[PDB]
Amino acid sequence: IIIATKNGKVRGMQLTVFGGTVTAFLGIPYAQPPLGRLRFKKPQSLTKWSDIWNATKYANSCCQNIDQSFPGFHGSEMWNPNTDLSEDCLYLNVWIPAPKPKNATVLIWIYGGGFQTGTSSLHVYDGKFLARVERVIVVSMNYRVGALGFLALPGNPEAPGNMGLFDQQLALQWVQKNIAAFGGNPKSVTLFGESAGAASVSLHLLSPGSHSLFTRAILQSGSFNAPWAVTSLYEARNRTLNLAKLTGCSRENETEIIKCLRNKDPQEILLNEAFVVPYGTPLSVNFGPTVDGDFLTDMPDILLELGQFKKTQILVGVNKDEGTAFLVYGAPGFSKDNNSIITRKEFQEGLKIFFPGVSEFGKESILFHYTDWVDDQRPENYREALGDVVGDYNFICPALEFTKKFSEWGNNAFFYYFEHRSSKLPWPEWMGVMHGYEIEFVFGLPLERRDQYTKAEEILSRSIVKRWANFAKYGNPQETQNQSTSWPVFKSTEQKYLTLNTESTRIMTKLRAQQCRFWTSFFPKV
Ligand SMILES: *[C@@H]1O[C@H](CO[C@H]2O[C@@H](C)[C@@H](O)[C@@H](O)[C@@H]2O)[C@@H](O[C@@H]2O[C@H](CO)[C@@H](O)[C@H](O)[C@H]2NC(C)=O)[C@H](O)[C@H]1NC(C)=O
Ligand SMILES: *[C@@H]1O[C@H](CO[C@H]2O[C@@H](C)[C@@H](O)[C@@H](O)[C@@H]2O)[C@@H](O[C@@H]2O[C@H](CO)[C@@H](O)[C@H](O)[C@H]2NC(C)=O)[C@H](O)[C@H]1NC(C)=O
Ligand SMILES: *[C@@H]1O[C@H](CO[C@@H]2O[C@@H](C)[C@@H](O)[C@@H](O)[C@@H]2O)[C@@H](O)[C@H](O)[C@H]1NC(C)=O
Ligand SMILES: CCN(CC)[C@H](C)CN1c2ccccc2Sc2ccccc21
Ligand SMILES: *[C@@H]1O[C@H](CO)[C@@H](O)[C@H](O)[C@H]1NC(C)=O
Ligand SMILES: *[C@@H]1O[C@H](CO)[C@@H](O)[C@H](O)[C@H]1NC(C)=O
Ligand SMILES: *[C@@H]1O[C@H](CO)[C@@H](O)[C@H](O)[C@H]1NC(C)=O
Ligand SMILES: [Cl-]
Ligand SMILES: [Cl-]
Ligand SMILES: [Cl-]
Ligand SMILES: [Cl-]
Ligand SMILES: [Cl-]
Ligand SMILES: [Cl-]
Ligand SMILES: [Cl-]
Ligand SMILES: [Zn+2]
Q1: What is the largest CA-CA distance in the chain?
Q2: What's the gap in Å between 79 CA and the centre of ligand 13?
Q3: 10 Å Cβ neighbour count for 177?
Q4: Does residue 123 have an active-site annotation?
Q5: Active-site residue among 87, 384, 435, 438?
Q6: The domain at 1-526 falls in which architecture?
Q7: Is there a contact between 174 and 213 (Cβ–Cβ < 8 Å)?
């Protein structure tokens, strides 16, 4: 199979999925490799090739530091890159239904990873199931991360910031220019992503350069208004100068620092990325999105509040235990190999880890808001309270505030609460429905009967896959055939949302009302 793109011909592979066929094009280049003088620059356009490019294996992953907290443990290593790390990494993948569709809706995946890590070749991002079951086209791209993707001295085009975001944007442009040759519909394109990928998706709703490159958006466990998602412009320049100091690149003429950084090999950049922040947290984002005056014209909180974004439908949601994953990355008394019963004193030490520069009074009122027990005798009270603190503050409350503000401008919005713990989840039970472990259900991995998911998990995945595809195709995430409960629109007044679980599906209102009132209204003033 060979498809003529506008820059040259590409060859894919046939895959057998569920007694049928899916065609895969893995590793299509969409930009000139950002090497040499092109490091830290925005992505440049690709030049034509007259031969046939073989797109038959995942391409290199972008340079990044690997998680090594649990060597040999599948729970953490399933997120580590599974191809070689290289600066030559700006490639994308395309999954096509077989036979060739005539005008299929396109789903574009943007992976997360704190803007520091990530790759589209991960097993749980495999788009072949979605192409097979719902006959949509799935696209995913690799984008630069860390300093090589988000180092910023604003206004300076040698390192303007938001390069990884522009990588994503150029991939969206590739779909616009090429997807029809694959049988796809460039007028029906839905972005979806998780964590930092969901925050990227929400920034594409704000960026005018991206407004004509997609139709709808899905935000799983993330948004730009989350406290970890946007780097202040003070912080950006500090961490840039700190990295120059650590490497030996402190110049005075600010353009001369970047040329010094361009002569360091990528490994010396990666080794020093960690220490650009003096006192970080488990949720620290060393180099992330900034207000650059290009991709981002103003502070995103101002654009959201004043209705300056793409007007379209959105699907937003969170998991029940978003915070627990971060507790085994620094909190005292927590571990993946015990049950992590902590004391009140260990709870107070956890808050200092996650809220280092906050007043003594601020941590006291976090403790006060989250220690009104039902059962005063339960030993896991403080353990579960600290996870809820981290999850509410960093993910759930920002996502709800995002949806409320977005829908106030007349757009249909739908919110979900994912509360099923995967039967193949390798982390212990006390960590619950963790950050990132709805992804395998969205991509339809439990549909593979040869994988030891339960029968109920196959059913829930089949339902989620249909809702997601119906949202992309028709702007309405209903499962209309098997007498499901209807997913109601999220409005600022009643704030209805749908729960996703094996046992039951229910409509509820005002998720975490009391806790998010504290985080969104009171806490910013301490
Ligand atoms: C902006 O950065 C400076 C310099 O950052 C240094 O901090 C070290 C801890 C280390 O990471 C090194 O690589 C880096 O260059 C910050 O100054 C430092 O701030 C910390 C925390 O307050 C102090 O402990 C250090 O003594 C201090 N060093 C100096 C030379 O001033 C500065 O605070 C930072 N601005 C922020 C975080 O707003
Ligand atoms: C849950 O585990 C933590 C972590 O303890 C680590 O070190 C060994 C004890 C190992 O067996 C394994 O449990 C784990 O890798 C326990 O906290 C530790 O407690 C000791 C006791 O003095 C302290 O010295 C350590 O600093 C501390 N580690 C951390 C990360 O806080 C904790 O006691 C345990 N809880 C249980 C068993 O209920
Ligand atoms: C493919 O379909 C195009 C129309 O797509 C529709 O446009 C708007 C209303 C969006 O809501 C989108 O989701 C819809 O699917 C046609 O204009 C085009 O000619 C068609 N092309 C081919 C080759 O069939
Ligand atoms: C998949 C990796 N995940 C744990 C194994 C980490 C903690 C996620 N993470 C993350 C991942 C890589 C590097 C830094 C971070 S800080 C962060 C902030 C906001 C969302 C996610 C992240
Ligand atoms: C691309 O794939 C075809 C089919 O396997 C192969 O014969 C061809 O030689 C490949 N091109 C290369 C390796 O340049
Ligand atoms: C800094 O160096 C650049 C590159 O040579 C030059 O264009 C610019 O004028 C210099 N500016 C200052 C203030 O030295
Ligand atoms: C609806 O139910 C049938 C069995 O009655 C099942 O095979 C099918 O996959 C279900 N559809 C969805 C979208 O879940
Ligand atoms: Cl469009
Ligand atoms: Cl940070
Ligand atoms: Cl709950
Ligand atoms: Cl006390
Ligand atoms: Cl609408
Ligand atoms: Cl309710
Ligand atoms: Cl609640
Ligand atoms: Zn992740």
Answers
A1: 72
A2: 35
A3: 14
A4: no
A5: 435
A6: 3-Layer(aba) Sandwich (3.40)
A7: no
